[PDB]
Amino acid sequence: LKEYQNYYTTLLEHFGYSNEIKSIIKDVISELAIFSGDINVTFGNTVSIKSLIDLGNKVKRFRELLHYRLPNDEALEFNDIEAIIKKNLDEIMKILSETDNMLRYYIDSGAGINSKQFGQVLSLVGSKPDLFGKIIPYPINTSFLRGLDVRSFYINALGARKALITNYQQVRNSGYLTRKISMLLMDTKLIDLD
Amino acid sequence: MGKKLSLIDFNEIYNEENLITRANPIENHEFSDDGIYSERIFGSYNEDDDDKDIDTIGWINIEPYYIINPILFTIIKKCIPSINKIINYQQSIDQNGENIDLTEEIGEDDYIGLVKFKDNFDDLLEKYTDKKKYQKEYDFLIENHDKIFINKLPVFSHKLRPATLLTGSKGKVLAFDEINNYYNFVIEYINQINEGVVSDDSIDLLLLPLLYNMQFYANNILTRIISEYLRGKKGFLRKNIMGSRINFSARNVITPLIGHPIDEVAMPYKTFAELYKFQLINLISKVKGINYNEALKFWEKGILGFNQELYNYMEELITKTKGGCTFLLNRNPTISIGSILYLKIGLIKKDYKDLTLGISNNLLSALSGDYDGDVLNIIPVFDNKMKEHFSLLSPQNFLVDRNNGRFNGDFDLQKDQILGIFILNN
Amino acid sequence: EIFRITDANLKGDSLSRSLLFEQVKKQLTTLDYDTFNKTKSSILDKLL
Amino acid sequence: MDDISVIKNEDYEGSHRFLAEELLMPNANKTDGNRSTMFCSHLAQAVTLQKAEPPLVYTNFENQVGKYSTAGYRKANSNYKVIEKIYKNDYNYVLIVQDQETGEYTLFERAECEFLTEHYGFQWDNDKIDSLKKDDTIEKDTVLYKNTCYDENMNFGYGVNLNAAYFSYKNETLEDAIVISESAAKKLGTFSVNKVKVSVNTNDILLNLYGDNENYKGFPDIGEHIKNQIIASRRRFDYNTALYELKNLNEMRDSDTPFFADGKIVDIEIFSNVPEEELKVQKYNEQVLYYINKQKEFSNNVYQKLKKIVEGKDNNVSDKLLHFYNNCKMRIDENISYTYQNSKFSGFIMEFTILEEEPLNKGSKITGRYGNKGVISKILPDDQMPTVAEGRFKGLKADICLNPLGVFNRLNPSQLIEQELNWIAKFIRKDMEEAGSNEEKVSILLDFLNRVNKEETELMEEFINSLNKTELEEFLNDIIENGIPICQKPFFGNIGLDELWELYNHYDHIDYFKCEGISTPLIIGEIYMVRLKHEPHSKFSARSTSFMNLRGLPAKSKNFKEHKDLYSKTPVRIGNMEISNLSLTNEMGSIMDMLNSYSNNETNRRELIMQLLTGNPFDTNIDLSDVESGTSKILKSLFTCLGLSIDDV
Amino acid sequence: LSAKHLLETRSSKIDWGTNFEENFIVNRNLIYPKVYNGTVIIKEDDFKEDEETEEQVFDTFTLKSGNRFISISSPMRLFLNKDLKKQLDESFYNIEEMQFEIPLNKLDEGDSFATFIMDNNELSKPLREIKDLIETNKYIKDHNV
Amino acid sequence: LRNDQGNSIINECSIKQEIAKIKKKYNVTDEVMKEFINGRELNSIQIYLVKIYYSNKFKVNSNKNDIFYLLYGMTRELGEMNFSIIPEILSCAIAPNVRKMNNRKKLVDKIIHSDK
Amino acid sequence: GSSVEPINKVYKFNKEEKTSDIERSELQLIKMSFLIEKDDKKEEINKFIYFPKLIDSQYFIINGNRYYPIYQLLDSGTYRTNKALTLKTLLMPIVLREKKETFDDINGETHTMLNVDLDLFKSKVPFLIYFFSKFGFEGTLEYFGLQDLIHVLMKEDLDQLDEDEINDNVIFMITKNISLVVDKNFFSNKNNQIIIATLLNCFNTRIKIDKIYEKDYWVKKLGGYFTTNNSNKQEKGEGIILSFERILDEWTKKILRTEEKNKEDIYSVVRWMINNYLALVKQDNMNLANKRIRLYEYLLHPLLIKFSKGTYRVLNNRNSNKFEKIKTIFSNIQEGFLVKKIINNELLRYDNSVNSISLFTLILRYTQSGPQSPFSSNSTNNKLRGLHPSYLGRLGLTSTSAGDPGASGSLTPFLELPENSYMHFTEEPEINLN
């Protein structure tokens, strides 16, 4: 599908950026989307919790990944923790995509299932920052689906509050920067000298 | 071709016909005739018969004394220091009355009085001017020497500083803007200086201290006007000059619409029946064969509840007109390219209770918004000649990316439409 | 000489841009930025 | 930050002492914090529903919350005994009651509305109080009247149960959009009550909107419904010229001041400041002369009814009763003049309370419990929506379709668990309904309840064995009809993942429903829906030409607040960056002409208005003039006040 | 806005040193020695006032591994154990030799010795420096185009 | 606050359209107006009557030229009907002062007892 | 004293052109009495004030509108801010500020210590000079309890100083001739060293042996610190002392959790605060163990403000009869003072709710903003908007206002406030200090 953008840009420059070819391309976009809608209704796209459960019995490697807790008998730095999560998350995308399942078309197109976000639902979360950026030295050992604990709950609440404070502050001071640059860099003009 | 700012002279545009001499703005339970809120000069508040332009300005006469120009005061305070303690009178006295000279601590020239400061201004400058640190300021004052001392202080109309004489049972209440307090102080002071008629050597301690105090209030007037009307964000400079409110406008919500070209939208019945209000009356008047007064009351009844006679005239308007009715749609705030577009109208919703604007899904990504419940602003465009200049902002012209020259990625398949094609294409 | 974007506009040569940006009191009372000698034309002068 | 080390999970075991406002939402230990924190605001903004129902999956915590919220129901503090009851209107009436343990006296007033805020309210479902009559006895636990939320047996409820499925419908569910069947829209409802204050002076009159000249009905009656969204219109009258002005009072004129409102009028009250002798003769002021008189009659009644109580030697009365008695005895006296806003008005002023039912319309918002906020986009007849036509229970139809794209991306897997639980409940309910006598039927239920919440089994067994045969049969029939309730706690005590795995494994006869014309297995469950306050008509605004500010620029006018107009005629301002983004195009003269002719120059505005009104409607070729704008004059005046001028060249 | 919404952040490797690895296996925000017999010798001037908590932070020290000794160059700041600091005031306080003596044999086995805090590498840090280039005049003043 | 502008503009345009139609119908020229005005000023009674008759369609403005055109239409329309006294009264000027008179109950009785 | 007056009455028919209001409101009458006494005049002033009454135990009804009271959360006091230790008070926020200083002994050893100043009345003044003015030199030495360790010796005594006691008792310079005798064991503790540093900072080069025992010697110094004119240097200073004895009121006495011995008056409070300066400054701020909730004291503010404004004017009067000014203090008391000031300043929050679920929405809601609130949007104090591990178990970590995070939460319904502690979450402070 990414090859489509290369096709359109090979059409504009072929006909010399004419005003007529812009209208025709504007017509193609409308017709392509309308016929796309009919496929969704007839075929249907669903998300079901039973889809994950059914896959567990057939594929043994998936069962171990679902119930995975960080071993606590070995010393691990904060660099090794990130290595484990990336190692496990990478293997998840290989098994799901290669084999048939409900979510096969959700991953191959890569539109709706972000690689990092989807890992938190299945695999463990890891570590979270605090109000002052310092890393909290209490990594979460349980995935979202498997459940949470009270000590882990407090760490999660810190992350949510930081989003509200940052979002509110950025809204108050958002257009301050764009006003300064826009006022100055406006008087430029193009001449046609060779 | 090029705007330029420079100083002005008060004595050239002075008008003798209108001037203000009164202390109490209120007399006989009404606004006075020669006060600050006078109706003879500045006009009337809620009366349109007077037809007095805002540019009308008033004058206050000060004579024969002179004052330092308030605009130039901050410059002079930097050219030489200690101006606050050089135009003030602090004469001491012994028991009998003989003056005691305590000038040992003070400088050679201090506490001389304003009326003597003006006479010997040329000689006083040379003593305390630094030629290696304030070279620019020194040359500026030499060029503009006539406007150092002013004679008359202007005052603008009350249309910008309103005041109400609303009455109540507990007693009459008067409310005004803060600037009026200082304007009523300078008039009172000057009125209390010219009482002397017979030729008499006025005592210095009775007249000189008042002149210095008056200049203090004159300086604060310039600070107040520039710190409350122009400098602030809510001031007139950044609210009514570079931005403005505007008529012929509406606000609405977003609701997805399918099965139509990419530049066709459908507006609710109510908003389109009032934005294009004036053109509707013109169409009704000719067909129905009635004058404008009779047609107006017909349009009033056709907007309270949904009907059919008005709708038939509505549909024909968007079909026969040149170019089709169009409007500019933007989003608060605009920070991204294409946040404001130039769309077209192609459908009118039959329902009366519907109050949502129906747009396509592809065009949504351009605004970088979503259906969370944001409110847009709609501004129609009328002039035919003006339309051709705005056509460059249409979504057709944004199809090519200005950044690189390739096909723009924003006006492409996004969200579920990407998934739908992949199922069929593979 | 290169300048900060805030001081580049104030110490420029235009008049319309200076008054509509910031620091109204500083530009009109004193002459640190020398507002009295900026006569360059601009496309935004039509508003004034 | 190492202060976390003080927190220990040993003590926080089996007790929900660390949750505020999250007690209602179940499975709170699954969703993240960013989505959970939205639930508090969503619960803070939730309007009342007419057909409120208790949730199917309850957290066992809402009952106490409902009991301890005293803003919706009023019970009897102590055992009372009815003394008297008197009428005031068609609906509203009051009653005076006496204690049996202290000798004090109190009052209870029956109403038909409540003004929670400027727009939203509810309607009292006063049923028990009406049945009380003729010196009965009120017990300690009895409830006089209650809101629409509370059901018959004090069970709380703040939403509805709707059949739902995850599906995509013609890309109409992009981002956050919801389609909904017509039956669900009929089920969902809302209330609305507003108060309007009309004013009349000596000069003004009221037009004969309703009725002919025989009955000069200026305003609607007590129980009638208003028409054309016009409650009353008053026209100014001048002494100098009235011969050609009052020729026909049955039609609107050019200079009128009508009042707009919608609904059904329930309550009125009129306050007057004119002598009655002058009001007795005016024919047009007829209907008022009726109501006022009736009102006074009511007051006289109380002065002749309980005057033996307060004025007697007992005097054991509560503060409310004494205050009401003094207020009602104020009116019947002479030489009394009211005041409003610390001022003495001349003409009389009344009050109107209007009630209306607003159905669900396009543009509204509905959210679930887990903060899966959505927006209604397009409603359909129930025929179009997907249906199952292959299984044993053919006929079930989904009522709402949600976006399937943003479920995992939103990081909240609770909705899947709830839908799966309700689907398993549906299957087990159908299996129980298929066959089985009452002797073993309950067993089929108990097994299912054994693997979901072990705490519920004991209460199930106790309640089942407590009843007799007939009530047990009735309860089984009721659970067959509606559905098996499933209880699980928010934080400690619920199903996770292994329990779901085991539950799925045990039941091997379960398959997805096969819809018609879909060719993809699908599951339909039941979910909880709560309406939200946000509405499209509360922010929609348009403006053609309203009142202008003193300077000359358009400005906000306060007329919508007093119900003098339909739309909030407020203009939208062009921001700091809007002008620049418009100036993105190299054309600037067109921008200047547009701004000057729209909101700067008066002569240009008038010329444009005239040229648009008269001429050619199909094609417009306006030609603006050149006249110095107002803003230029304002700036020149201010600058010459400062002492500086702008010089060209 | 969007990138900052990604709460999860990356971590950077830290080179503790040869003698650091041979004697202390660091687990998260904790430090444990191989053998408790070896003591630690710290001079008076080593301690410095912390920027935030005002506690004593000894960035560099040399362990007193009996007769042998190897200097330690800790890349990050170190916080002394709360338990051991209680006895440091009088017992372990060694002003006579101008060098504190901390006998690890006094410390019990499997106990905390030193806690260190680490700041994550903010993904928004490069974006901020772009803004600072225009205004702060830190780098733009003393360079050509 | 000041009044609105749309209603005023509509009323003024209605007056303009009405005077244009009056010109069109009777092909009146400016010479007719010169010979009909006689240079007389505006008195109150004629203004009141003109406001009375043309009240339903629109309202009378303050411009004297439009008022005199509407008065010529007044005279033509009420002379072509059965009325005779009113056109003659409105034709020429009026007395500077309005005469005072008693109750005139006899003529008042005549008008009252009339079915009109 | 003051009391609530009865309001129940049965109206009797009258003809006096009575005025009644259209809208309903509920009020209650409070009567206060004062006895103004003079040489001959002994006037008695009885004032009456209207205060809204709590109906339905939840809301006030004023002018036909409904208003919901809300709790306010604020620190108990004696907390720490940037380079300062502050104690909240009704109207006068006494604050202690610390600054580092350098000193050299006789042998030339250099020490860096701390000196504390009371930033009261817009000035920087050493905290020891107040005690030196009130109780005197010897009086202050006895009062602190360090008089057995502090001595002053002259030049001749310095010549005859104990050589073997030089190491045991460190001798510090006072003037070119006068020396100070103090023990090294007393000098061991930093908190003890604070007093020595402040005492050495108070004195100057010019001194007289007999001037030390005279209170006026530094009373005039305090006056010169306050008033520059030499004529009034005495008198003005005296006034300050009087004011310094009235800074603390009864409510702050009742609120504080310290024992009785450290609660007699302002001087005892200052002594107890300065004895344990290090431990107090080492504590944190965000902990909940030292915070409380108020409901009415933040509603009775305007009356206190008006009384303070009235009393300052009569305190700053000169060469006039006092009785007239004292009468003018109480002359203006409007029956609608409290209601108007409360409504106009938006102290109460307008009731704007749409749902019937009121338990979690408005019954239990606390805001950190309002009068005497450190929270401020423009101040950008992100520390106050965060969370602390002490929040869990006694507050809601989830419910936050989307408009301004951290400024509004919700109390946990299971919270059990300890009885007879004036709305205190705990019964002991965060730092035991035991």
Numbering used by the authors:
A (entry chain D): 99 to 292
B (entry chain d): 1 to 426
C (entry chain D): 584 to 631
D (entry chain C): 1 to 649
E (entry chain D): 390 to 534
F (entry chain A): 291 to 406
G (entry chain c): 51 to 484
Describing publication, verbatim:
Here, we explain the mechanism by which the phage AR9 non-virion RNAP (nvRNAP), a bacterial RNAP homolog, recognizes the −10 element of its deoxyuridine-containing promoter in the template strand. The AR9 sigma-like subunit, the nvRNAP enzyme core, and the template strand together form two nucleotide base-accepting pockets whose shapes dictate the requirement for the conserved deoxyuridines. The catalytically active AR9 nvRNAP core enzyme consists of four proteins that, when pairwise concatenated, show about 20% sequence identity and cover the entire lengths of the universally conserved β and β′ subunits of bacterial RNAPs. Promoter-specific transcription is performed by a five-subunit holoenzyme that, in addition to the nvRNAP core, contains the product of AR9 gene 226 (gp226).
The structure of the promoter complex has been determined by both X-ray crystallography and cryo-EM to resolutions of 3.38 and 3.80 Å, respectively. In the most populous class of the cryo-EM reconstruction and in both available crystal forms of the AR9 nvRNAP promoter complex (i.e., AR9 nvRNAP-Pro-cryoEM and AR9 nvRNAP-Pro-Xray), the enzyme bound not one but two copies of the P077 promoter-containing forked oligonucleotide—the downstream copy (as designed) and (fortuitously) the upstream one—resulting in a superstructure that resembles the complete transcription bubble found in open complexes formed by other RNAPs. In the structure of the same complex analyzed by cryo-EM, only three nucleotides of the promoter (3′-−11UGU−9-5′) were sufficiently ordered for model building. The −8U nucleotide is partially disordered in the AR9 nvRNAP-Pro-cryoEM map. The cryo-EM- and X-ray-derived structures of the holoenzyme in the promoter complex were very similar and could be superimposed with a root mean square deviation (RMSD) of 1.84 Å between 2563 and 97% of all Cα atoms comprising the holoenzyme. Although weak, the X-ray electron density and cryo-EM map of the upstream oligonucleotide stretches from the σ2-like part of the gp226 NTD to the gp226 CTD.
